[PDB]
Amino acid sequence: GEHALRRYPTGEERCISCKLCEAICPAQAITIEAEEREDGSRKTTRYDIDMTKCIYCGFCQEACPVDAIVEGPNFEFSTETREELLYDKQKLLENGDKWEQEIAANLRTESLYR
Amino acid sequence: PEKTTFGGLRDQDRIFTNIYGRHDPYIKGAEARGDWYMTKDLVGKGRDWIIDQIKKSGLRGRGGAGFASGLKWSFMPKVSDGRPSYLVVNGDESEPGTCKDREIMRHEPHKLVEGCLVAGTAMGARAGYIYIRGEFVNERKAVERAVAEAYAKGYLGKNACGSGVDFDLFVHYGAGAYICGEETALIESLEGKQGKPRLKPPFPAGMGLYGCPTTVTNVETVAVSPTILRRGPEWFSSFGRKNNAGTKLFAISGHVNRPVTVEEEMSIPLRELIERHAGGVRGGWDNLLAIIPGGSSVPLLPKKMCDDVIMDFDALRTAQSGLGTAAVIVMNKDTDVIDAIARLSYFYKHESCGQCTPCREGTGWLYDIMSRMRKGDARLEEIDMLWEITKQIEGHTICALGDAAAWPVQGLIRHFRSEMEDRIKNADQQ
Amino acid sequence: LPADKMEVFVNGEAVVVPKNFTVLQACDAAGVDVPRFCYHQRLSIAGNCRMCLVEIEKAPKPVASCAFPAGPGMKIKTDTPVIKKAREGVMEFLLINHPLDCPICDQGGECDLQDQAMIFGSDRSRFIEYKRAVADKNLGPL
Amino acid sequence: GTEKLLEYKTYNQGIPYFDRLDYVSMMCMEHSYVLAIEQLLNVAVPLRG
Amino acid sequence: TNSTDVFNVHHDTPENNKDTKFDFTEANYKLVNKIMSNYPSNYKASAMIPLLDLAQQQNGGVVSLAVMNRVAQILEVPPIKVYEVATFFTMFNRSKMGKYHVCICGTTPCRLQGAQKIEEAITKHLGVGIGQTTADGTFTLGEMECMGACVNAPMIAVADYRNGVEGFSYNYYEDLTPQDAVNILEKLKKGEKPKLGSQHRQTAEPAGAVVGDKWIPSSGEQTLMGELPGPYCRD
Amino acid sequence: FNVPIAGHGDCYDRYLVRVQEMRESLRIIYQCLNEMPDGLYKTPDQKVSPPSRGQMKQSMESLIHHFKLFSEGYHVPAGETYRAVEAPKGEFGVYLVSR
Amino acid sequence: ATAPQDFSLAMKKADEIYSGKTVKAGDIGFSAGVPLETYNRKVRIFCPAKAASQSGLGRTLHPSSKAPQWKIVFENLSKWENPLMGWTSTADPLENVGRSTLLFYTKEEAAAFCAKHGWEYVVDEPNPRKHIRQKRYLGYGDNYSIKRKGVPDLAHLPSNRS
Amino acid sequence: PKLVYDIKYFARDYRRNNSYTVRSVDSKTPFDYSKVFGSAPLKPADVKTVRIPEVMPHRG
Amino acid sequence: AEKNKIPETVGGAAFKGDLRGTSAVGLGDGLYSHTSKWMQGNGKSPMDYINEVEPIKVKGLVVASHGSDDPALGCPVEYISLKGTSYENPAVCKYTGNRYYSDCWKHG
Numbered sequence A: 001g002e003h004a005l006r007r008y009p010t011g012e013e014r015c016i017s018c019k020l021c022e023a024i025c026p027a028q029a030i031t032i033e034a035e036e037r038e039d040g041s042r043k044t045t046r047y048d049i050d051m052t053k054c055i056y057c058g059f060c061q062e063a064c065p066v067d068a069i070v071e072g073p074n075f076e077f078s079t080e081t082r083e084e085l086l087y088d089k090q091k092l093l094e095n096g097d098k099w100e101q102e103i104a105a106n107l108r109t110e111s112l113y114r
Numbered sequence B: 001p002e003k004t005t006f007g008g009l010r011d012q013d014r015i016f017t018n019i020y021g022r023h024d025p026y027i028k029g030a031e032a033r034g035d036w037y038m039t040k041d042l043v044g045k046g047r048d049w050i051i052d053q054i055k056k057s058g059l060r061g062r063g064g065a066g067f068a069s070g071l072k073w074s075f076m077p078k079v080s081d082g083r084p085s086y087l088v089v090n091g092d093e094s095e096p097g098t099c100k101d102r103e104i105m106r107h108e109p110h111k112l113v114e115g116c117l118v119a120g121t122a123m124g125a126r127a128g129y130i131y132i133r134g135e136f137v138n139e140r141k142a143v144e145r146a147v148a149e150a151y152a153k154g155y156l157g158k159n160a161c162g163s164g165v166d167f168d169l170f171v172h173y174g175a176g177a178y179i180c181g182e183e184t185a186l187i188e189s190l191e192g193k194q195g196k197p198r199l200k201p202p203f204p205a206g207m208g209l210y211g212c213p214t215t216v217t218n219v220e221t222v223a224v225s226p227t228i229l230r231r232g233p234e235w236f237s238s239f240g241r242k243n244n245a246g247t248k249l250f251a252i253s254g255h256v257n258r259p260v261t262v263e264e265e266m267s268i269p270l271r272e273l274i275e276r277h278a279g280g281v282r283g284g285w286d287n288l289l290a291i292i293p294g295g296s297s298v299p300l301l302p303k304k305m306c307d308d309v310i311m312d313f314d315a316l317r318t319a320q321s322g323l324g325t326a327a328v329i330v331m332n333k334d335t336d337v338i339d340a341i342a343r344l345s346y347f348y349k350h351e352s353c354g355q356c357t358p359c360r361e362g363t364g365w366l367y368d369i370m371s372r373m374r375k376g377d378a379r380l381e382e383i384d385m386l387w388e389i390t391k392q393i394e395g396h397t398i399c400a401l402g403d404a405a406a407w408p409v410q411g412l413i414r415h416f417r418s419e420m421e422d423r424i425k426n427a428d429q430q
Numbered sequence C: 001l002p003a004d005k006m007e008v009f010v011n012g013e014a015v016v017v018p019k020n021f022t023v024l025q026a027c028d029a030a031g032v033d034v035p036r037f038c039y040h041q042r043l044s045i046a047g048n049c050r051m052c053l054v055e056i057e058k059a060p061k062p063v064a065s066c067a068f069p070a071g072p073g074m075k076i077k078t079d080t081p082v083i084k085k086a087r088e089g090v091m092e093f094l095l096i097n098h099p100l101d102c103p104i105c106d107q108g109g110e111c112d113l114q115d116q117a118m119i120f121g122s123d124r125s126r127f128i129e130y131k132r133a134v135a136d137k138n139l140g141p142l
Numbered sequence D: 001g002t003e004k005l006l007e008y009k010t011y012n013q014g015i016p017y018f019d020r021l022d023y024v025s026m027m028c029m030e031h032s033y034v035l036a037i038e039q040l041l042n043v044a045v046p047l048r049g
Numbered sequence E: 001t002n003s004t005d006v007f008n009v010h011h012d013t014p015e016n017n018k019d020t021k022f023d024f025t026e027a028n029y030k031l032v033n034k035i036m037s038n039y040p041s042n043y044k045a046s047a048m049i050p051l052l053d054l055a056q057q058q059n060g061g062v063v064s065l066a067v068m069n070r071v072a073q074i075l076e077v078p079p080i081k082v083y084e085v086a087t088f089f090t091m092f093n094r095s096k097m098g099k100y101h102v103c104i105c106g107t108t109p110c111r112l113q114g115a116q117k118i119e120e121a122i123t124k125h126l127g128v129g130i131g132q133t134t135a136d137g138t139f140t141l142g143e144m145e146c147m148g149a150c151v152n153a154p155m156i157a158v159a160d161y162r163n164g165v166e167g168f169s170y171n172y173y174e175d176l177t178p179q180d181a182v183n184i185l186e187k188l189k190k191g192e193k194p195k196l197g198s199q200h201r202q203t204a205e206p207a208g209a210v211v212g213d214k215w216i217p218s219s220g221e222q223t224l225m226g227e228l229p230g231p232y233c234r235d
Numbered sequence F: 001f002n003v004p005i006a007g008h009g010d011c012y013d014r015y016l017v018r019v020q021e022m023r024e025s026l027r028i029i030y031q032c033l034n035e036m037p038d039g040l041y042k043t044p045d046q047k048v049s050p051p052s053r054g055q056m057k058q059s060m061e062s063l064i065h066h067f068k069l070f071s072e073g074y075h076v077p078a079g080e081t082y083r084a085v086e087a088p089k090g091e092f093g094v095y096l097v098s099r
Numbered sequence G: 001a002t003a004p005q006d007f008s009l010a011m012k013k014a015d016e017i018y019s020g021k022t023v024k025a026g027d028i029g030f031s032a033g034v035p036l037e038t039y040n041r042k043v044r045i046f047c048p049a050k051a052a053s054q055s056g057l058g059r060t061l062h063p064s065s066k067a068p069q070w071k072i073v074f075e076n077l078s079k080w081e082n083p084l085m086g087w088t089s090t091a092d093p094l095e096n097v098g099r100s101t102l103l104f105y106t107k108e109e110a111a112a113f114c115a116k117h118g119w120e121y122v123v124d125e126p127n128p129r130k131h132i133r134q135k136r137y138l139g140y141g142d143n144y145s146i147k148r149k150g151v152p153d154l155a156h157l158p159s160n161r162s
Numbered sequence H: 001p002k003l004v005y006d007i008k009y010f011a012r013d014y015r016r017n018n019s020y021t022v023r024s025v026d027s028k029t030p031f032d033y034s035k036v037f038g039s040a041p042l043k044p045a046d047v048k049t050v051r052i053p054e055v056m057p058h059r060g
Numbered sequence I: 001a002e003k004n005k006i007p008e009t010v011g012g013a014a015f016k017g018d019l020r021g022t023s024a025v026g027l028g029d030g031l032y033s034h035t036s037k038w039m040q041g042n043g044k045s046p047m048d049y050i051n052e053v054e055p056i057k058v059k060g061l062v063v064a065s066h067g068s069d070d071p072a073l074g075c076p077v078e079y080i081s082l083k084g085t086s087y088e089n090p091a092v093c094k095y096t097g098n099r100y101y102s103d104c105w106k107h108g
């Protein structure tokens, strides 16, 4: 369903800007640009997904090595303007925060199979 | 010397005579024992005569290679192209089972110096370096005193020993590394760099110390050469079997009633050596798990093979082992073979210089796997994996330390797979 | 074979090269590409990685192409199964202590190690032990 | 323009095209594509799959 | 159970850092000149290891950064070469060292005859452990590989770093049972000089073996007993 | 399973064929359910199939294979092939040309 | 350099058996049906050089390489940023076609294609790569030669000293 | 799985080990109709049939 | 000031005085901090979260880091050198940002 960037339990984002999800995206819906953070971490300065270009294949969730990007269980995300459907890093992180427990339970169940 | 049976070397046939240090090891005793006797004549006879006499003697190289000494010495260039020739004596004796070279350095210093003179004349080497282990401080002091004495009486230097030949000898010492015993790594260490072996397709005879033709030979070969030229090549050839003629210094260590260093003709039975000179295995011959014949590099042999095995190069090759150095190590039934071979694997992990990928990584891998097997943590398939890794290392390294790391583990797998399986299963069972 | 040029056989095909070339140089002249990590055209030959191993009929054991001088009438085999197995083993030894830092490595799309792992390596590992760890030090602003 | 779009994508990136070629029967449509890639790749499918 | 040096990079310490100054004393400098004379003038870097050993003996057993830089200046080489060689070899100690450096061989031939129990007795009596200097600073414990003393397998080696170049000795104590090792170390604490070589026997004669905590004296067949053959020449 | 056949060719005959095809597919499903094997569901080769997640997180070679399969993808040998399947609407085939 | 000995054999054979009929330069461009201002764009025919990060020779013009390596590329045009989302916006229809799909084995093939469509082209030959080691380090033996510091002077010998 | 501790891709590499051989065919040499119709049945009893392949190739 | 300052790294997973790898994003807008470029609010940043977590003492010279507690539900396994590490200057996991330090090298 709706995409969501995830955080570690400490509150640090899981994303390490490998940029594999952008390379595997069949529709080219993900644009990523990154930098070195002041502490020294490899972190993204931009992570936006076009939900009017997404095909919800789930390939990006497959390619991510740290489980940073997941397709959440939410299918109620219609909008009244197309601009609200161009997600960005802050919106994706907020969506990950809102659905954290459900996503974690689904991932714990799914880990057994794969 | 009889073709049927070999053993029981007599005192009259022993080259190394103050090996036990009952007499003065310095120049006064050395002259009275037959050292520096008629070196003028032997050296004056020419390099060609010495080379042919060494070739006829059949002297193979002590130190592990076993390569014929005369042919190696004959590979040295005959005429200078502007580059001097060097003789380097490998007195670095790092090997986990070998103690034999230290007695020669400390109790027969002058035989080694006379041999250096003879061999340098045989190879046309202006200068010579005696590499000694850094740990052997006192042995080095003895050798240095011998060199100074030989210089004082004119045995060395210009017009050495009265013959129209010129030879200068130096004593150099390392800082501790098993790899520095290898021919190229020793040359690199003496040049002043890290003791990392050089790829062999350039050979030391072509380019060696300071880019000049060099030959690296063990202390024992250099020491035995002068008396071979004095006593005679036929006398040297008589003792051993075909292709394996001379006497060799056997250092018996481990679980034996008396650990001894002794000189014996090659092709003695291992049982005969252990029972006569070492006093027998602690607890009798019945109390044998295994015997490492040629120091730790070569694969071990089980008791059954030790029954009929003969102390020779080619025969130990037939028994899937080798007489690298006459460093025979005896293990009791009480001994845990797994732990000793794991300690040898740790030795090789510690002594790798790290230059090439296969040794640097696979030797540590081997140590880790052996450590897990010492406790039974591993699975049964881990043994087959261990054999595969040993095959991966062998042949793909710059020098032979990868091979020397692979071999003991392969011997353990080949002859004592039952005990490893027992340990792995029992730990799971209990 | 005019004067300095000799003839060498690489995988059963005749190549004319100067005398001063090595085995790797003739293999490049033959169109065969040998896996390399430490050999560089403008740097001194090292021979440490041992990934260039090929087979010479004369030699008993595989030799390093970068540092082996080529000889007249030498036959060079770069596709023998022993060479394939040696390549895979060397690749395993290279990867056992390598950190699992591919996503965070800035060499991710341009790594020789990854590409030669895919081409000349096995797809799976048997290493379960602890890997080596190094502490980095500053070499400057760049 | 599906056929020309396939030319700009990798083989695994082009599988979702076949699902959307026929919205009634998706599995059969992607199946032929994966079979052709398997034939060219000489890949053997396990029996459970 | 790591040895003295755990770092292959320079660890800044109040004793060891850049400002520290090391130079050879005049007599040690004469020894330096004699050491260099053995190697060709153009290939002067051949003396790096003997010079580093001499500087180690002078500096009390530690090869400091100033020592390496001084040796590199004298040999006219980039300092990285001296760093590499000082790091490669084992005898070169790059950390602070005690008055005595006691080394126990743990390789296989020593481990069969009981090197483990020797080390256990030594670490109990000294009370620190391998790689750790005594709290007094009198002994630094170390494990080294084969020392060339396999026939006299249970053995230790001690280095006298107190007096300096004039009074430095690297001696071997062999055929030793744990109680003998403890006795040798107590003698070393007093300053009394113990018996060089094997305690029970002179050298690698056929005299007996160390079994457990006791020496079992067995003497059977001897070879070099009698009159030595002497000079001979082929005719 | 048995092929359903009619002869007239009219609309009714094709409707009857499609119903019988549904029944034959039910039979095939029952056989699939009863004979479903156990083991791998994807090819063991990891140079054409992605590694498992624990495996990529524990092995260097598997992380390399995962990275190069999710960025570059596998390389298909030069060749051409036409593979057809019995789709519900008929025969669906792909003519794939690889360089 | 020997032979691929695969489908490329039949590929090359189909090439040599068949041929194309000659037409005047630019005539096919009218048949193509694309905007005629496309052919006003200028063409650069080049082979990419090797990336400095990697040591593989596949991408280069080397006997190892069996793939087409000569690209037709068009000149770069204006690019801007989307005011709303900062995406890179463009109006160039031919932005990625030449890099992505226009690959040719030989320079003459790309020149023929350009002349057939009417594109003006400039061919840039790659800088030649010769695998010749320098004389100082021509071989592994040269690393440990006397060239480093000269032949060892023997004036340090005790006989020569005294 | 026997691939856990035994890794050898070159033995299990079928993708890169395919090749194409070359032949030349000429009209002068007659076709062998004996091969085509000599093995053909002349009576119902002699009919031989090729069974449908049950499974596609798998590595096991 | 930030307009003419050299981009620098605080040094938690880097060194105190190094250059920071920077793209040109936000250069026109005038933002020169990593978090400013992507967060427009005044809330707590994830870097503020990771700084609040304290370094953890471990035994040995190497620690295995899986990011999360379960190995297959977090970052790839990583082996971090604990040599020359203390509470004030801890080692860092590059994937997770967790900080570790050990006293074993000091022979303890």
Ligand SMILES: Cc1cc2nc3c(=O)[nH]c(=O)nc-3n(C[C@H](O)[C@H](O)[C@H](O)COP(=O)(O)O)c2cc1C
Residues within 6 Å of the ligand: B060, B061, B062, B063, B064, B065, B066, B067, B069, B072, B090, B091, B092, B093, B094, B095, B178, B179, B180, B181, B182, B183, B216, B217, B218, B219, B221, B399, B400, B401, B404
């Ligand atoms: C790793 C390694 C260590 C070696 N250590 C020694 C050694 O300590 N003493 C020795 O005489 N030979 C040692 N050798 C063998 C050397 O090749 C030696 O210099 C040479 O074989 C002497 O030749 P020789 O048999 O004619 O005397 C070692 C070889 C290797 C590969």
Ligand code: SF4
Residues within 6 Å of the ligand: A021, A024, A025, A026, A027, A028, A029, A030, A049, A053, A054, A055, A056, A057, A058, A059, A060, A061
């Ligand atoms: S689900 Fe597929 S299309 Fe959507 S963002 Fe992820 S990879 Fe791209």
Ligand code: SF4
Residues within 6 Å of the ligand: A014, A015, A016, A017, A018, A019, A020, A021, A022, A032, A060, A063, A064, A065, A066, A067, A068, A069
């Ligand atoms: S979401 Fe995952 S795949 Fe995408 S850039 Fe971040 S870590 Fe990489």
Ligand code: SF4
Residues within 6 Å of the ligand: B179, B196, B197, B351, B352, B353, B354, B355, B356, B357, B358, B359, B360, B397, B398, B399, B400, B401, B402
């Ligand atoms: S085999 Fe080991 S010791 Fe020999 S060169 Fe290679 S890494 Fe060094």
Ligand code: SF4
Residues within 6 Å of the ligand: C098, C099, C100, C101, C102, C103, C105, C106, C107, C108, C109, C111, C112, C113, C114, F064
């Ligand atoms: S990209 Fe290459 S160098 Fe970096 S971690 Fe991966 S394999 Fe190692």
Ligand code: FES
Residues within 6 Å of the ligand: C035, C036, C037, C038, C039, C046, C047, C048, C049, C050, C051, C052, C064, C065, C066, C067
């Ligand atoms: S390229 Fe490394 S050994 Fe030749």
Ligand code: FES
Residues within 6 Å of the ligand: B095, B096, B097, B098, E105, E106, E107, E108, E109, E110, E145, E146, E147, E148, E149, E150, E153, E155
């Ligand atoms: S094994 Fe200890 S001195 Fe030889």
Ligand SMILES: [Zn+2]
Residues within 6 Å of the ligand: I065, I066, I067, I068, I075, I078, I093, I094, I095, I096, I097, I098
């Ligand atoms: Zn972590």
